[PDB]
Amino acid sequence: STGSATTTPIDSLDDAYITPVQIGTPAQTLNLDFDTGSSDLWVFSSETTASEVDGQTIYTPSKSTTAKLLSGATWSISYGDGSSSSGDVYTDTVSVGGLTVTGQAVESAKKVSSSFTEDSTIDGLLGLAFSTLNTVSPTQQKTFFDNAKASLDSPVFTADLGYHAPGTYNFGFIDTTAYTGSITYTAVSTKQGFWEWTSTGYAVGSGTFKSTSIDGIADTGTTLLYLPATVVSAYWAQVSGAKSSSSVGGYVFPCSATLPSFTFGVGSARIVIPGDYIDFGPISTGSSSCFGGIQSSAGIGINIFGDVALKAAFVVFNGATTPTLGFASK
Template sequence: MKVTNTAAAIAAYVLCCRDLVSAGPVQKRGVLDPLFEITTLGGMTFKISQVPNKKFYGQRKGRGSMAIARAYSKYGAAISDDLLSTIEEILKELGLLGNDGAGNNTTADPQGEVAAVPQMFDSEYLCPVEIGTPPQTLNLDFDTGSSDLWVFSSETPSIQVMGQDAWDIEQSSTAKLQTGESWAISYGDGSSSSGNVYLDKVSVGGVTVQNQAVESASNVSVSFTQRPDTDGLLGLAFGSINTVKPTQQKTFFENAVSDLASPLFTANLRKAEPGNYNFGFIDTTEFTGQITFVPVNSSSGFWQFTSEGYSIAGSSAVSAPHEAIADTGTTLLLLPQEIADAYYSQVQGAVNDVSGAGGYVFPCSASLPDYTAMIGSHQAVIPGDFINFAPVDGDTFEDATTCFGGIQASPANFPLAIYGDIFLKAQFVVFHGGNNELGFANKPL
C-alpha cells in the first residue's frame, strides 16, 4: 500500500498490530446470584472462553511505542512527532516501512511480519459472533470503549480485505438495508471506516437479537485492513456514542439485556492465559472477596467511574481523585501524568523517554512495585510484574535491557484516565447495565 507521508504510514500501522485471542465454545448456565438476591433461571446466560489465536501477525520490538500510539489515536489525541519518528525507525528496522523511490513511505504486506507469542503481549480478545440467516460466523473484538457493531462485508473493496472473513450480505435472507442510514468512525491518525447500515439477526453465545444494527464497511481504514484475523468490532459502551446517522442504534448488549437472566456482563481477562466474558450472570468462582460496586457516569457514553487515589508498593494511600474509563479495547493503563510520575519515581532507573520510546521505560532488571487503585472501598491491586509490558531493545524480555511500562500518562488535555487491559487482567469486573454500575473484585492471578 502506498501512502503519501511518513506520519500517515506510521499511524496507519500502529493501529493494526496487536496480539489476538479468539473465543472458544460457549456454555449456557444458570446460577444463584447472591449479590442481587435473585435466581437467574428465567433468562439466558452464556460464557465466552478465550483461547490463543495461532494466526496472529505482529512484531515484538516496539510493542510499547505502538501500544501508546494506538491508545492516543483511538481517543483522538495527537501523536507527537518524536513518537512518530521513533515508530518510523522501528518499522524500517523490521522491514515494515520502506520508500518506493519517489519519496513516498510504504508499509509491508502483513504476511511478512514477524509472528509474536500471544501470551507475551496479550492485548486484544476476539469472540465468535453469528450474523444473518443462515448464520455466518465472524470473529469480533469486544470493545467496552466504543459502541458500533461493524464488520468487513461483501461491500468492502477487495483491496481492503487481507485475510478477514467478510459478512456476505446477499447470502442472508434476513438482512434489511436501512435506506438513508450510514456510519463513520474517525481515528486520531486521520484514517476512518464507514459504510451502510443493515438490520439482521445477530447471535452471541446463544442469545439472539433479531433486528440488530450491523454496520457494513464500504471503506476500512488501513489500521483494520492490516489486522487479518479481526473481522470487525462489537462495541459494548453506551449507545449514545454510536456513530450511525441520522438515527443512532443500540448496542448488542442494550438490545439483548431484556433476554439475559441479569442485566450485566463480566470481563475476566487473564495474563498469559485464556480469560472469558460472561453475559447474564456472575460466576462466584472467578473472584475472591466481595465485589465493590461504584456508580457509572454514562454521560460521555463510556463506562466512566471515579478512582479516589492510589498507593504504591503497599504504602499509605494518596488522595488523587480522577475520572476513568474501563476499556477492554485499550492495552495500557493510562493515568494522570502526576500519578504516572509518582509510580516511576519508585522504579530505579526509570525515565520518561517521550522523544524515544514514547513513554516511561526502565531497566528490564528493575523490580516493579505493585500499583493499587482506590475505587470506592475497593483496593484494586495490579502486581508489578503485570506492569512490565514489553521489551524496547530486543525481541524478548530475555534479550532486552530496556523495558516499556504498562502504566503510562493519559493524553494531555484528555479529561479521562483509561483503565485498559493492564488493569483489567488483574481484576474481575462487572459491567452492570441495570444499575448503571461497575463492580470490581480481586481474583486469583
C-alpha cells in the first residue's frame, strides 16, 4: 500500500505545516502537525478541557463506531519549545492520504498548554520519530508509520515541504518526479529515538564550504534551523546589522537586509537553503527588526534540522531494518 497527502503551511511564515488525517468511522478529519521529532499521535477531543479549546476541530470518540478505550492508558508529553499536553487513549482507524491503519493509538487530550490552545489551526500532532519515544503508559504504543510499515510497498515515508506553499507527505514510495538529481543517503542513529544524522559541513552564501561534522535531528515539527553557536555566528556575521538579542530570544536582523543562502552537507552532496527561507519577519507587528531562521542550539543540547532546512530538500525517512535518511535538491 501507499499514501499521499498534501501538507499546508499554517501561516504566511511557514511556522508549521498541517496535514489532514481521517480518524474513526465515519471519518472525522483533523489537521495534524506531522512531527518527525516525536512519537505520539494526539488530538484535541471532546475530552479536552473546554477553556483550552479555541477554534480547533475535535475528535469525538463516542461518535466513532470503531473507537475503543485503551483501558488504563494515559499519556503526557512535553516538547522542546516548552509546550505540553496529556490525556487518555483510544484505538481507532486512522487514514492518511489513502493509507489506512486499524487499531492506531489515538491519544485524546484532556489538557493542553496555552501555545496549543492559542493556535487554532493545529488539531493535534502525528509523531513520526521512533516508537521508543512514545509516552503512553503503562503500555507504550506504536507510531502510525510503525504500524503501517509492513503493509507499505517500501518501508519509507518522504517529506516534501514547501516554501510559502503546500507540499507533500508520501508513505510507501519515493516520487522520482519530486526532486532533481539524486538522493544522497546518510546514516541514522536511533539511540535517542530521533532521525539523528551527521551533516558533513556548511557554507554561508557564496563562501567556501567548511568540512565539519554536525550531529543533529531531522525534525519536521521544529520551525527553525538550530546549529552550533560557531556556525550561526558565521552566518549572521554576513548580514549587516544582525545581532543576537537576549530580550527577543535569538538573532535578529534589519528587515531591509538581503539574506545570504546557507548550504549544508549530506555526505558529498550539498543542500542550499535560499536566503529568503531564513526570514521569519518582524519580531512584533510593525517592527523593522526581523527574526532569523537560523539560531543557536547552545542550551538545547541537540542540533535541529527543522523546517527551514528540510523545506529546501526532498527528504526520505527510510525505515528499513537499519534506518537511513536521504536528501535531494528539488
